[PDB]
Design a protein around this ligand. Structure first.
Ligand SMILES: [K+]
Ligand SMILES: [K+]
Ligand SMILES: [Mg+2]
Ligand SMILES: [Mg+2]
Ligand SMILES: [Mg+2]
Ligand SMILES: [Mg+2]
Ligand SMILES: [Mg+2]
Ligand SMILES: [Mg+2]
Ligand SMILES: [Mg+2]
Ligand SMILES: [Mg+2]
Ligand SMILES: [Mg+2]
Ligand SMILES: [Mg+2]
Ligand SMILES: [Mg+2]
Ligand SMILES: [Mg+2]
Ligand SMILES: [Mg+2]
Ligand SMILES: [Mg+2]
Ligand SMILES: [Mg+2]
Ligand SMILES: [Mg+2]
Lengths: 208, 80, 325, 91, 132
RNA sequence: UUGGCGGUACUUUAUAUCCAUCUAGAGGAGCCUGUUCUAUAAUCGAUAAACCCCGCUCUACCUCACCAUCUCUUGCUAAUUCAGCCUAUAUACCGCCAUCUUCAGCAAACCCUAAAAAGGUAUUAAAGUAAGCAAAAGAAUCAAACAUAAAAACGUUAGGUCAAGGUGUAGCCAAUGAAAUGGGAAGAAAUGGGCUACAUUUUCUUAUAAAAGAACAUUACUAUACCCUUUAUGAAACUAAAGGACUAAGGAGGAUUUAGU
């Protein structure tokens, strides 16, 4: 890295800086005073104070990008969100007043609740004990649990789709199916959890 | 004459190797064999150490003063 | 039976002759350069030598020098005993007469304070002298354990009641700390022929360089290279990068910017403008806000630049395939 | 380290209790003169035990959903090609 | 291990001059260039001919002053003038140097068709930078 | 007693690294290229880690050192019963490097031991000490830092190179030397590396990587092969490029394995 270890990650929260001084906890108040005598990293090209920037969706975009084609990957995510909004508007208009209440037309809220439905609480680590490969039930961190949900989505759509279907049409159809706990990405989570019960007694081999 | 690990100070043997005479206070647990002029006595008490320090200090100053006087008397005789 | 050139220790007569030759040198160097010998100074000497003996060696220790002998010749500990052979200092046979002479003084001070019997922060923003600095004061070399013990003894002195004599003593072994000012330098505010206020600042991202000209009063009209910003930047992410400076300070639609970005690609040019606008926009915001910008990454130049390729490997870090065995 | 029963909740309470009396426990040993200079004491749970308990907590919370040549070690196929290739040269 | 132009370490009894002590990576950092011409500057011609002439000029001076050279020679080209600056030990009588200077200048001026001058600074003995 | 070893324990540990984690690849297909093998009248060297687009930042003649045929015998120089030799030995070497390695040691002068084959530390200090080389620092990437490069001793592998050049020993001198002409083939067989494709985050067109209109499985995606034309260099096209047809295989690659903070 070209940043020395003494550099601090930038804080790009607009409201945080403009809060009244008394509203800030003394711990936060102390850090701000310390940061005045430190070096701050430059903000990333994609780090902005925009009110429409969601870290979860921005991360999902980077996991789809191939060869640094951010314009294409962002376009694919923009087309997906729109394909989900247009799919719920059609259902909402073609539904009764009672049914209309339940229907969710926010694509950003369908994406977050979809991913969370696919996240697995426990995973598996492959281990070779006595020249035999065993996978031991592991408890997954918040970072490993989130990564696996996004990875499983980007892999079901990339591979298990018809040749002429497009990613905005497969991903939209999968975010909505996961949003209802019916999709194949949810089935992957159910299989992972079910296998952990099979290897329930083999967690002892853990050394880490 | 002992170091802080209860062993003879290295300079006792090294002063014998160089043929340097040694005046040492030697308590009951010490080894006086290589001390040229051993002085049996207490080495731990502050009042004992303070006495020896004064004796060695008064003695050395007297001997240095005597030399100054001895030189002046003999030197003065040369013109006189 | 080792045969190498011995240390050419410098006596006082030697250094004294080296100072007479230097004093005669200055009078000649002054006569050459047409300057007055009386006023000729060390700074003028270095300038004269650099003109008359141009050297382009990167290391400046290897360049020609005509310095006063004190600067060049290492000052050396003098003889530690007289003609009769009696060492001058009573702690000579310790081998560290100057380190132990100092530890003798501080231990005697500590004893008098403890026998004889307020806030101890008489000095703030100060540090203890580093081992290299202490060694110079004593004119001898110390170990890490020797330095650590000296500090522990000095700390004990501060803990105890200290008269003004002690405070002056510990002061000699305290070096003033300079806390670097990590605060932005505000730009000037020029005025146009029309009379409108505006500030200018440059920005650099990767190989792109920008020169923004923010105006105090505007409707949010940003023109890049004489073109609009929607036309110049057809990508949303590049426009979002131009929005970050103003949106952060809730100053959207209040300034008119004229940019000139040359070099780099689409993303590097937007980033370069972002920094240039943030630095120009400093002149029109409060100092609390300027610190708010600095702590959000808007005023730091990004040092990440393309790395060179290395011979013998595919890329800057990519290595050629390790062939199968 | 102290032995840790299966019940996670009780272990958490026991951990706090022991830790509060850590200073007094040290005093008791130092006072009795069994050990003259005892340093500060800590009470820790075996990480192996904690993980095994966590792998059980998450498992309960988790939802299981709705109800030939390479065997011997000689590449007989490759060796056949080497022999047939030699036979092609012979013939 | 790199071997180029590196005088290696022995037991601290090997005298080395300043030029010999410094390895190739110190060129332009601690020690300069022995030859100074304009043929390696950007957009300049006749580098090969300046380099070939230097190789010969160094072998010529070594043989013409056998055992009398304290250090490598320095070649300085200005316009069509060539200047050879050599540190030479004080072994030979003074009049012998005057013969070799007149001879080496005339011979090298009629061989390369340029004015060649020889500059000799006599040292009492080789100057030792360090013992390695 | 020292070192090496231990399917002997107990602690540290590796930072793109031993396991785990992450991304794109190799391993399958077609080509380009090296090596081996086969093989040719027909070079040489490199050839576990540390060879295998390696000496070559480069072989149509030349280059060339190889093979076949023909020819020359004081045969490049001022002189020389001399010229010349890519003849043998890198296990005689210089020169210039690989490797452990960005590893932390190497060597020399002293001093000490109820003798020493060796070893020599304790910091509230007990026999170790004062200097060199490496490291460090410094300099380079034209502010600053970080990073990257460079740097990296002494040894280890009789490591690589007598074919860069030079050179010790031995060998040829009407030939192992010099010159001319024509040749130096072949696989498709194993293997190393690379390139391209297998497509939908794709295919073609205009723009410019924004956007739009078409294409989208039997020949759609898709050959930098073979073949057929034209052009460039040259004396020579056997070479390279650009078009044209023609289509094959390829449907994301077993064991295993490379690189990246
Ligand atoms: K060699
Ligand atoms: K091949
Ligand atoms: Mg006693
Ligand atoms: Mg790359
Ligand atoms: Mg690895
Ligand atoms: Mg392959
Ligand atoms: Mg060989
Ligand atoms: Mg040929
Ligand atoms: Mg030929
Ligand atoms: Mg031959
Ligand atoms: Mg060898
Ligand atoms: Mg270095
Ligand atoms: Mg060998
Ligand atoms: Mg030869
Ligand atoms: Mg050979
Ligand atoms: Mg496009
Ligand atoms: Mg087609
Ligand atoms: Mg032609």
């Amino acid at each position: 890295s070209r940043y020395a270890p003494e550099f601090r990650e930038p804080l790009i929260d607009k409201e945080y800086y403009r809060k009244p001084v008394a509203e800030l906890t003394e711990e936060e108040k102390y850090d701000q005073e310390l940061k005045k005598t430190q070096f701050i990293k430059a903000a990333a090209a994609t780090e902005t104070s925009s009110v429409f920037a969601d870290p979860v969706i921005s991360k999902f975009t980077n996991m789809m990008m191939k060869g640094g084609n951010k314009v294409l990957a962002r376009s694919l995510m923009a087309q997906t969100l729109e394909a989900v909004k247009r799919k719920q508007f059609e259902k909402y208009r073609a539904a009764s007043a009672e049914e209309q209440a339940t229907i969710e037309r926010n694509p950003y809220r369908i994406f977050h609740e979809a991913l969370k439905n696919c996240e697995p609480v426990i995973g598996l680590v492959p281990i070779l004990k006595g020249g035999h490969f065993y996978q031991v039930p592991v408890p997954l961190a918040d970072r490993r649990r989130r990564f696996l949900a996004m990875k499983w989505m980007i892999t079901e759509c990339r591979e298990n789709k018809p040749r002429r279907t497009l990613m905005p049409e497969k991903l939209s159809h999968e975010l909505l199916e996961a949003f209802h706990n019916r999709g194949p990405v949810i089935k992957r989570k159910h299989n992972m959890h079910k296998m952990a019960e099979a290897n329930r007694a083999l967690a002892h081999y853990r050394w880490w | 004459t002992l170091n802080n690990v209860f062993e003879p100070h290295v300079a006792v043997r090294d002063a014998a190797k160089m043929n340097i005479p040694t005046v040492g206070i030697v308590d009951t647990n010490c080894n006086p064999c290589l001390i040229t002029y051993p002085i049996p006595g207490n080495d731990d008490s502050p009042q004992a150490i303070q006495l020896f320090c004064k004796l060695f200090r008064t003695t050395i100053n007297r001997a240095k003063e005597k030399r100054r006087q001895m030189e002046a008397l003999h030197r003065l005789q040369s013109p006189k | 039976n080792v045969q190498a050139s011995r240390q050419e220790s410098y006596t006082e007569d030697f250094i004294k002759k080296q100072i007479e030759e230097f004093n005669i040198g200055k009078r000649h160097l002054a006569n050459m350069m047409g300057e007055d010998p009386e006023t000729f100074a060390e700074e003028d000497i270095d300038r004269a030598i650099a003109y008359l003996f141009p050297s382009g060696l990167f290391e400046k220790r290897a360049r020609p020098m005509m310095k006063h002998p004190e600067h060049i010749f290492p000052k050396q500990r003098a003889t530690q005993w007289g003609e009769d052979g009696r060492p001058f200092h009573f702690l000579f046979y310790t081998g560290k007469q100057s380190y132990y002479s100092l530890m003798h003084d501080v231990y005697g001070k500590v004893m008098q304070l403890e026998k004889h019997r307020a806030e101890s922060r008489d000095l703030i923003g100060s540090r203890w002298l580093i081992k290299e600095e202490l060694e110079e004061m004593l004119v001898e070399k110390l170990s890490d354990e020797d330095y650590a013990q000296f500090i522990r003894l000095l700390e004990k002195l501060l803990t105890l009641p200290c008269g003004p004599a002690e405070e002056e003593f510990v002061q000699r072994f305290r070096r003033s700390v300079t806390i670097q000012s990590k605060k932005q330098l505000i730009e000037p505010v020029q005025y146009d022929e029309q009379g409108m206020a505006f500030s200018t600042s440059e920005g650099r991202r990767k190989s792109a360089t920008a020169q923004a000209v923010v105006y105090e009063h505007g409707s949010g009209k940003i023109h890049v290279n004489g073109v609009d910003y929607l036309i110049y930047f057809p990508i949303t992410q590049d426009r979002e990068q131009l929005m970050f400076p103003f949106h952060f300070l809730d100053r959207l639609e209040r300034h008119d910017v004229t940019c000139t970005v040359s070099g780099g690609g689409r993303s590097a040019q937007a980033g370069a403008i972002r920094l240039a606008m943030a630095r120009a926009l400093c002149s029109f915001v409060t100092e609390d806000e300027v610190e708010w910008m600095r702590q959000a990454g808007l005023l730091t130049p990004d040092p990440r630049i393309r790395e060179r390729k290395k011979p013998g490997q595919e890329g800057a870090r990519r290595k050629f395939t390790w062939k199968k065995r | 380290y102290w032995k840790t029963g299966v019940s996670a909740e009780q272990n958490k309470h026991t951990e706090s209790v022991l830790q509060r009396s850590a200073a007094y426990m040290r005093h008791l040993l130092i006072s009795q003169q069994t050990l003259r200079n005892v340093p500060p004491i800590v009470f820790v749970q075996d990480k192996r035990d904690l993980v095994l308990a966590e792998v059980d907590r998450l498992l309960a919370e988790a939802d299981f959903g709705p109800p030939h040549p390479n065997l011997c070690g000689i590449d007989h196929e490759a060796l056949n090609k080497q022999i047939m290739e030699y036979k092609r040269k012979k013939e | 291990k790199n071997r180029a132009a590196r005088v290696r370490v022995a037991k601290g009894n090997k005298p080395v001059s300043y030029e010999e002590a410094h390895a190739p990576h110190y060129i332009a950092h601690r020690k300069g260039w022995l030859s100074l011409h304009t043929g390696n500057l950007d957009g300049e011609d006749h580098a090969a001919e300046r380099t070939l002439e230097d190789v010969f000029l160094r072998k010529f001076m070594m043989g013409t002053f056998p055992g009398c050279l304290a250090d490598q020679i320095v070649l300085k080209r200005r316009a069509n003038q060539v200047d050879i600056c050599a540190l030479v030990l004080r072994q030979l009588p003074a009049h012998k140097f005057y013969f070799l200077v007149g001879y080496s200048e005339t011979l090298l001026s009629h061989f390369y068709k340029c004015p060649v001058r020889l500059h000799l600074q006599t040292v009492p003995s080789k100057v030792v930078y360090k013992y390695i």
